[PDB]
Amino acid sequence: GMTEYKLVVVGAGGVGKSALTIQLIQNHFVDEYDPTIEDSYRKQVVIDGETCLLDILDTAGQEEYSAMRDQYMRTGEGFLCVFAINNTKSFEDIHQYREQIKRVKDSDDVPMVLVGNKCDLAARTVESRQAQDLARSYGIPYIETSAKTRQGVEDAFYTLVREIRQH
Amino acid sequence: MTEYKLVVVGAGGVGKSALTIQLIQNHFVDEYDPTIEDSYRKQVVIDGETCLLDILDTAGQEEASAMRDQYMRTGEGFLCVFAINNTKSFEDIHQYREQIKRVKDSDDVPMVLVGNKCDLAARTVESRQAQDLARSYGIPYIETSAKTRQGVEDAFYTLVREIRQH
Amino acid sequence: GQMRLPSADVYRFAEPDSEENIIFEEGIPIIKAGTVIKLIERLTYHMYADPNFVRTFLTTYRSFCKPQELLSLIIERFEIPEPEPTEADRIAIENGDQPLSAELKRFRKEYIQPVQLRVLNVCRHWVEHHFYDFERDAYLLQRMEEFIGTVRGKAMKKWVESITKIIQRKKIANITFQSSPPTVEWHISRPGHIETFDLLTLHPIEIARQLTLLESDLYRAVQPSELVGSVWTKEDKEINSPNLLKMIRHTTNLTLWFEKCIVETENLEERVAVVSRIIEILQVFQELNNFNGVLEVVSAMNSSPVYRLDHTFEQIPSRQKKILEEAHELSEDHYKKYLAKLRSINPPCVPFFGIYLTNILKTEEGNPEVLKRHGKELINFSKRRKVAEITGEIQQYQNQPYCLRVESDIKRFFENLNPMGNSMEKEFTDYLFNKSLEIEPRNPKPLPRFPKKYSYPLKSPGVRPSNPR
Ligand SMILES: Cc1cc(Cn2c(N3CCNCC3)nc3c(N4CCC[C@H]4CN)cc(Cl)cc32)cc(C)c1F
Ligand SMILES: Nc1nc2c(ncn2[C@@H]2O[C@H](COP(=O)(O)OP(=O)(O)NP(=O)(O)O)[C@@H](O)[C@H]2O)c(=O)[nH]1
Ligand SMILES: [Cl-]
Numbered sequence: 053g054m055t056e057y058k059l060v061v062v063g064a065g066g067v068g069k070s071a072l073t074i075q076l077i078q079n080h081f082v083d084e085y086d087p088t089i090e091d092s093y094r095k096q097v098v099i100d101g102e103t104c105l106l107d108i109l110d111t112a113g114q115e116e117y118s119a120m121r122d123q124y125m126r127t128g129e130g131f132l133c134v135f136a137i138n139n140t141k142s143f144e145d146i147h148q149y150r151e152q153i154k155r156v157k158d159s160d161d162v163p164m165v166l167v168g169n170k171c172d173l174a175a176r177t178v179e180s181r182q183a184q185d186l187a188r189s190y191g192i193p194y195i196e197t198s199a200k201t202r203q204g205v206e207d208a209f210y211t212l213v214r215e216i217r218q219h
Numbered sequence: 220m221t222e223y224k225l226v227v228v229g230a231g232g233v234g235k236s237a238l239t240i241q242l243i244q245n246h247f248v249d250e251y252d253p254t255i256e257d258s259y260r261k262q263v264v265i266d267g268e269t270c271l272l273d274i275l276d277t278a279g280q281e282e283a284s285a286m287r288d289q290y291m292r293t294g295e296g297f298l299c300v301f302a303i304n305n306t307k308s309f310e311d312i313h314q315y316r317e318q319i320k321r322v323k324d325s326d327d328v329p330m331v332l333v334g335n336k337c338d339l340a341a342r343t344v345e346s347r348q349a350q351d352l353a354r355s356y357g358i359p360y361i362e363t364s365a366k367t368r369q370g371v372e373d374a375f376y377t378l379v380r381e382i383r384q385h
Numbered sequence: 386g387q388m389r390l391p392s393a394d395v396y397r398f399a400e401p402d403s404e405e406n407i408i409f410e411e412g413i414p415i416i417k418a419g420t421v422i423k424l425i426e427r428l429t430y431h432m433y434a435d436p437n438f439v440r441t442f443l444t445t446y447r448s449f450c451k452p453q454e455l456l457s458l459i460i461e462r463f464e465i466p467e468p469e470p471t472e473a474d475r476i477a478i479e480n481g482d483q484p485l486s487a488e489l490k491r492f493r494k495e496y497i498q499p500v501q502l503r504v505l506n507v508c509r510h511w512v513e514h515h516f517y518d519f520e521r522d523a524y525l526l527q528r529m530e531e532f533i534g535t536v537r538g539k540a541m542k543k544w545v546e547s548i549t550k551i552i553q554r555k556k557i558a559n560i561t562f563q564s565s566p567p568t569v570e571w572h573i574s575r576p577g578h579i580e581t582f583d584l585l586t587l588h589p590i591e592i593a594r595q596l597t598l599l600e601s602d603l604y605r606a607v608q609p610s611e612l613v614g615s616v617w618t619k620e621d622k623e624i625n626s627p628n629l630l631k632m633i634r635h636t637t638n639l640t641l642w643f644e645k646c647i648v649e650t651e652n653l654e655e656r657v658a659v660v661s662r663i664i665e666i667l668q669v670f671q672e673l674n675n676f677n678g679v680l681e682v683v684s685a686m687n688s689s690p691v692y693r694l695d696h697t698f699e700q701i702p703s704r705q706k707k708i709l710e711e712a713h714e715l716s717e718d719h720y721k722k723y724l725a726k727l728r729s730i731n732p733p734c735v736p737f738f739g740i741y742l743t744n745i746l747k748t749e750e751g752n753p754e755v756l757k758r759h760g761k762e763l764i765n766f767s768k769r770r771k772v773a774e775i776t777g778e779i780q781q782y783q784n785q786p787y788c789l790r791v792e793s794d795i796k797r798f799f800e801n802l803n804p805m806g807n808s809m810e811k812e813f814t815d816y817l818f819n820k821s822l823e824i825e826p827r828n829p830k831p832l833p834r835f836p837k838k839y840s841y842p843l844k845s846p847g848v849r850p851s852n853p854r
């Protein structure tokens with residue numbers, strides 16, 4: 053029936069990456085979660101008037117299993133590359149995540165978005181202009197999100213779906 | 220996976236905890252640390268069916284004797300343990316049997332009679348006397364050693380079969 | 386009627402339950418949220434024991450209460466005032482008679498003694514299963530030793546003396562089986578010739594057995610203190626989660642070793658033998674319920690350097706393609722078949738830890754620390770119960786030992802495995818991918834030929850065990 057998009061979230065650990073998918077798939081208006089629940093990572097949405105099913109893989113917490121990255125990434129059609137705006141190292145990691153995705157997918161043009169995540173009130177160290185410049189150099193969109201207010205979360209996932217649809 | 224709530228009861232020092240830890244960890248505990256209440260879980264395939272055993276290990280010391288109704292209400296089946304070198308622990312069995320029946324308001328509660336410490340030569344309770352008691356209750360009698368593992372799986376898994384068939 | 390209680394002014398744990406201090410989930414009650422005072426009251430409740438709650442609380446409480454404060458609170462819980470004589474007792478005493486003290490005796494038997502025993506059970510579980518609090522705070526240990534060592538009165542004496550001994554044993558701190566382990570199996574490498582040990586010269590059965598013993602030991606060593614609070618993801622992860630990280634780094638090294646064995650075997654026929662041997666090891670991992678091992682192999686075969694080796698794939702026997710495909714199917718649909726298989730097998734097993742880590746992290750990130758109700762902040766205990774359900778599952782699979790004999794030299798070989806050498810991760814995984822491109826170039830570049838590198842027979846001895854008398 054409706055199209056299912058397999059999305060994969062990648063990025064450094066320990067800096068709130070998991071809040072992106074939790075806030076999306078959540079009961080938006082009840083701050084609660086059981087990730088063990090079958091299809092706590094599947095969500096039917098309407099994007100530009102077209103209903104589809106998002107299947108989101110977020111292996112947050114498994115970052116030390118670095119030799120499993122290919123196994124996980126191979127499942128995906130589009131990728132959210134996430135860094136924290138108060139963690140410069142996580143921003144510097146983005147280049148290698150993108151290179152690894154290109155290699156797994158055997159393509160120079162994989163649907164992907166760059167996401168800068170605000171995970172606390174600690175001082176921002178990556179300015180939006182730096183991240184915009186990086187995204188432009190890659191030819192991909194940039195979305196900033198809050199890990200607390202849900203701002204930007206729908207835009208991040210919907211923009212990625214549009215990237216897949218327009219590939 | 221069906222879940223089974225087993226409760227191990229009997230006089231202080233008969234080996235309830237040693238039996239349970241042998242089942243759970245394949246280890247024999249030499250120390251005698253009196254239990255207040257401990258609980259364990261074990262996934263195991265019995266007669267081709269996977270289940271999850273919740274095992275409640277209870278206090279045998281008489282100072283805890285007023286706190287039993289609460290665990291007898293929740294248990295599905297009971298291992299009634301005495302030690303074959305302690306006649307007093309065998310005489311205490313009928314008090315546990317009667318209390319379980321009262322609390323669960325049932326004459327038909329899954330139970331197994333366990334004579335533990337069967338590795339020791341100096342027996343004071345003869346198998347026949349225990350078997351006669353078990354027959355009067357309608358339940359099997361299994362002799363065990365928490366030290367050697369003799370009969371340990373048989374005791375616990377027979378109780379599971381009793382609950383299954385209940 | 387119900388027993389009367391001490392005045393809440395002299396004993397804080399007698400405040401009535403209300404929605405301002407405890408909330409229950411919709412035959413003992415399950416707590417959704419409460420003040421720390423109410424959680425401790427129910428942890429040590431006079432009407433029933435709740436061993437699951439004791440484990441849940443002691444595993445997770447540091448997110449809402451400091452260890453020093455917990456000890457102060459349970460000592461306060463323990464010190465229960467006794468009621469004054471009743472009117473009937475007074476009249477007896479005024480006549481020179483001994484009072485019946487019926488209400489006092491009932492309160493001792495049905496309130497004080499169960500609450501005090503359940504406080505001691507918390508202390509006992511705390512010392513036996515969560516002793517790290519005391520290892521990290523010597524003053525906390527002194528306070529516990531003093532509290533236990535000064536409990537008076539004969540009703541508690543057996544457990545006070547026992548807990549005192551347990552503490553002293555923990556400060557200065559054997560398996561029996563239903564049958565004998567199978568005989569250790571040898572192939573080209575013979576016992577004591579560690580210099581020849583390699584993927585194809587050790588027996589594939591024994592490779593799988595010794596890796597399973599190693600991976601089982603690594604799995605069994607991970608304590609809940611390495612997991613609660615998501616501490617393995619934070620800046621101090623090497624301090625707080627060392628056994629977990631050692632376990633993960635072993636898994637990563639084995640996956641990279643499999644990839645390295647494959648792509649450094651440049652001759653096609655030899656590389657087919659290497660891959661075939663790895664899938665045989667995977668088969669034995671499956672037989673042993675070593676799911677960590679299964680996924681180590683699957684991750685290697687799905688890696689970018691190996692996945693693209695179509696000429697190697699073409700020569701793998703159909704039956705072995707099927708073994709690998711069914712192993713990969715365990716991971717599909719968010720590990721649906723893996724989860725069902727783990728829950729159906731007869732242990733011992735070695736679970737894959739990664740799923741637990743993601744579920745703990747998302748449970749802690751996706752639920753609030755407190756619930757606000759009637760102007761009060763209540764501890765969200767349901768969130769902690771969910772974390773402790775995961776740590777309890779982990780612990781349940783840590784109990785059962787494997788009935789397999791250690792081979793000390795093979796164990797040392799796999800403990801010391803270091804496929805990356807002195808190279809950094811990026812340089813090494815780039816090296817593996819460039820080797821892949823060398824041995825099977827991208828179309829339309831022609832496929833080169835390469836000389837053999839192994840001087841010994843490539844035929845596998847198979848994975849069915851042997852048994853001499
Ligand atoms: C046996 C073997 C397998 C692979 C690599 N590989 C391939 N390849 C597709 C591209 N052509 C090459 C083969 N498919 C899979 C696979 N899929 C899951 C569903 C079914 C199958 C379809 N993708 C799972 C896993 Cl884990 C490994 C897979 C490389 C070498 C060297 C091998 F010897
Ligand atoms: N020889 C032998 N000793 C045993 C056996 N089972 C238990 N013991 C010993 O008997 C003592 C009491 O064991 P324990 O398991 O603590 O008994 P318990 O019934 O749990 N006691 P409590 O009711 O106070 O909790 C320990 O020293 C233990 O090693 C057995 O099968 N053989
Ligand atoms: Cl839209």
Ligand SMILES: [Cl-]
Nearest residue numbers: 093108109110
């Ligand atoms: Cl996910």
Ligand SMILES: [Cl-]
Nearest residue numbers: 258259260781
């Ligand atoms: Cl357990």
Ligand SMILES: [Cl-]
Nearest residue numbers: 642645803804
């Ligand atoms: Cl190596």
Ligand SMILES: [Mg+2]
Nearest residue numbers: 235236253254
């Ligand atoms: Mg005991």
Ligand code: NA
Nearest residue numbers: 138139140177
């Ligand atoms: Na920074």
